Amino acid sequence: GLPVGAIMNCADNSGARNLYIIAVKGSGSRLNRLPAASLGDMVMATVKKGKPELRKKVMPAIVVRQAKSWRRRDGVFLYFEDNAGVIANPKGEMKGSAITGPVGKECADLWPRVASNSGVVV
């Protein structure tokens, strides 16, 4: 639900306020299309506001809230209240200890450490 150049929230307790995605890792290559992030996607994202130590530096981040209605495998169309991501290493191990807000079920199934720091699943 988020293309390149999308401001999303920061649901961990690291100190960033918003995460500005500048690249999507693992996206296709088609002319004039945009690499689109979604739930359970690790993308390069830059911090716009917050601590300046987290600003001016891109970090990998996994998206936990999407707010665009997707088709889950069981029959339901559903979407979160907002767009939100949590910054982490490329190894998927979290930076934040507790992730606030609801985390997607596919995203927590994808990453064991995000689910280890997930408080609220869906």
């Binding site: 191990e93 079920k105 927590a108 689910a115 720091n117």
Partner: protein, 226 residues
């Protein structure tokens, strides 16, 4: 007795498994290698149950329970819930929890007597823990970390905490526990000790990357050798 185990090329253990004294919950995903590993460990003594929780391989973070009870969140489907009820005997209690958050293995850590919880949990689940599990409930953070299960592993043997836990905090919390505590690493530097390994009163199961000093820590504080 401490056994290194791997699930689908991942060192995390408490994410996909739920271990009590009287049963074990395992995922259905991938292969039966991880299930046969527990069969080599647990065998015919305690029932080991394949399950999903709202269609997940992740079940140890989703579930929080003791030998006497098991708490499941709201999203647990009644096909899964009836399979758990037909699976587990009458001595284990099962009940869905109508609450905001779903992940229980992050939020409730316990043993057969004492449970530490999320200090901002609702009061109804704080009721239901001491009702079903029959345990003592305490609102507490382990070193200011509000997720108490992934950062603190419990049994009736002892307890293990993440290394950022202060020794003042360890004594402050072990007075509530009446079982000892050690700041411990697991899976080569991963501070997440509750999802990195599971423990009950005779067994501690961790990942392959849990080093021999970490295994000595677990083998000391949970007394894996008799």
């Amino acid at each position: 007795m401490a056994t290194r185990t791997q699930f689908e090329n991942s060192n995390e253990i408490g994410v996909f498994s739920k271990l009590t004294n009287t049963y074990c919950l395992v995922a259905v995903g991938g292969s039966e290698n991880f299930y046969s590993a527990f069969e080599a460990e647990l065998g015919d003594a305690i029932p080991i149950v394949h399950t999903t929780i709202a269609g997940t391989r992740i079940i140890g973070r989703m579930t929080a329970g003791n030998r006497r009870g098991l708490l499941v969140p709201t999203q647990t489907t009644d096909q899964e819930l009836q399979h758990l009820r037909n699976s587990l005997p009458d001595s284990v209690k099962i009940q869905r929890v109508e609450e905001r958050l779903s992940a229980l293995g992050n939020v409730i850590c316990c043993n057969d007597y004492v449970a530490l919880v999320h200090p901002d949990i609702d009061r109804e689940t704080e009721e239901l823990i001491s009702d079903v599990l029959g345990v003592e409930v305490f609102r507490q953070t382990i070193s200011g970390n509000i997720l108490v299960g992934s950062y603190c592993s419990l049994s009736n043997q002892g307890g293990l905490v993440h290394p950022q836990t202060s020794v003042q905090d360890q004594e402050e919390l072990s007075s509530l526990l009446q079982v000892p505590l050690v700041a411990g690493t697991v899976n080569r530097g991963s501070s997440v000790v509750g999802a990195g390994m599971v423990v009950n009163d005779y067994l501690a199961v961790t990942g392959l990357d849990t080093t021999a000093p970490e295994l000595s820590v677990i083998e000391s504080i949970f007394r894996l050798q008799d």
